[PDB]
């Protein structure tokens, strides 16, 4: 499962990295807890275009 990170994780990435995670990790932990979102075309475009600066300003 390819997911773009909306938060910093110790090993996965930091603030927007696209990373490949095992299916269950995204299905049951990251997506439901909001720490990452599936790297679909629309989601990636929206994150890169509109809310990148807002996510960065939401530092903590």
């Amino acid at each position: 499962m390819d997911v773009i990170l909306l938060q910093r994780i110790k090993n996965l990435g930091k603030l927007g990295d696209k990373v490949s995670v095992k299916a269950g990790y995204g299905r049951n932990f990251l997506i439901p807890q909001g720490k990452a979102v599936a790297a679909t075309e629309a989601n990636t475009a929206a994150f890169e275009a509109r809310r990148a600066e807002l996510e960065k300003q939401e530092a903590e």
Partner: protein, 77 residues
């Protein structure tokens, strides 16, 4: 009933065929299970009885679209 909501899969009929070509009736059953999915639009957990192929379809399309499609079909969730 053993019916997948996402895909509609249900048990089907076939044959056990032995080494001497004796045939007997059998059923092939789906890999059906209950699963809770988080829905942010409604802020709740939805429990669905579905298969692993349905899980793959959900991974591909997103929970919102699949739930909307089922509701349009007529399922109450």
């Amino acid at each position: 009933s053993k019916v997948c909501q996402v895909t509609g899969k249900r048990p089907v009929v076939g044959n056990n065929v032995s080494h001497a070509n004796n045939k007997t009736k059998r059923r092939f059953e789906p890999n059906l299970h209950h699963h809770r999915f988080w829905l942010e639009s409604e802020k709740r957990f939805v429990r669905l009885r579905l298969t692993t192929k349905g899980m793959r379809i959900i991974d591909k399309l997103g929970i919102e679209k699949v739930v909307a499609d089922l509701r349009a079909q007529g399922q109450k969730i």
